[PDB]
């Protein structure tokens, strides 16, 4: 799901950036560094609340060089998965072994081992949906998925969405 959490981040500035512009410039740098972040602790970082009134908290000048470190505090919106969650998502891509669906900012694979036993891949369909049962799932159609844990990766975060359940079925 999505949560609002006060997060902190440390930024170091080269001396050349020690001009009056830092008020807005450091907020900017925070925005580039923070926006669009993937992390197992906090899942996906979506947006930073209160884009003004950001907590600079005074720069700390290092002794090695003229760069100054800033402990930036900010409120931001993050997305997190939980084991055994239900999501009203949609199919992103089709595959013989299952489907890939969108779960907010996260990609979930809907594996054939966990779609209904009566539901089987139908290569003939275009897209090649699963059509052997009433649960017709395709890229264009919506899908409720059942998050079977989380599988985080360095580049991104993904999980497994099961459909073989009394709920969280197709569409």
């Amino acid at each position: 799901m999505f949560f609002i959490k006060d997060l902190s981040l440390n930024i170091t500035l080269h001396p050349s950036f020690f001009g009056p512009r830092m008020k807005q410039y450091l907020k900017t740098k925070l925005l580039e560094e923070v926006e669009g972040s993937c992390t197992g602790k906090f899942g996906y970082i979506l947006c930073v609340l209160d884009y003004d009134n950001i907590d600079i908290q005074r720069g700390r000048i290092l002794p090695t060089d003229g760069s100054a470190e800033f402990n930036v505090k900010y409120r931001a919106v993050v997305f997190k998965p939980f084991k055994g969650e239900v999501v009203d998502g949609t199919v992103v891509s089709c595959s013989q072994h299952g489907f890939e669906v969108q779960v907010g900012p996260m990609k979930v694979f809907v594996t054939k081992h966990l779609m209904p036993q009566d539901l089987t891949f139908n290569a003939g369909s275009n897209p090649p949906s699963y059509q052997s049962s009433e649960d017709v799932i395709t890229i264009k159609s919506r899908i409720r998925v059942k998050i079977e844990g989380c599988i985080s990766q360095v580049s991104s975060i993904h999980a497994i969405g099961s459909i073989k359940e009394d709920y969280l079925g197709a569409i």
Binding site: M1, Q24, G36, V77, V86, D88, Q102, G104, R142, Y167
Partner: protein, 142 residues
Amino acid sequence: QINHQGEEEELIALNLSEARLVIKEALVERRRAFKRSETREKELESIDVLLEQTTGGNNKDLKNTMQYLTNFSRFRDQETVGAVIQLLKSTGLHPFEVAQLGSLACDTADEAKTLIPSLNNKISDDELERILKELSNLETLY
């Protein structure tokens, strides 16, 4: 939990539609800061304008995330969101549970219990039946 402000703020189980509303407000304020420097279809297109006018477009996933979240947005009218917030939170429902009901479509109490195991064991179905029908009525209005 505790925020970084020294304040013991409890976990914010933010709802999907209310999350979208908050993000829209944040994008509007971001465009404002730059200046100092509804149906799901209308909302989806409008946000993309804010995202394009507030970000550089590098992070398309958030644009996708908002677009697909808007498609499944269940309480688009912010004013109606206030009702569901009161409907669920006023009952003492655990925030983790509140977000699910206020983000996922559900008709009957058993369906909510069926979908959410945590509710199945301790929740009052009578409130579910009352609230879910109220929210279901609100859901149809969109």
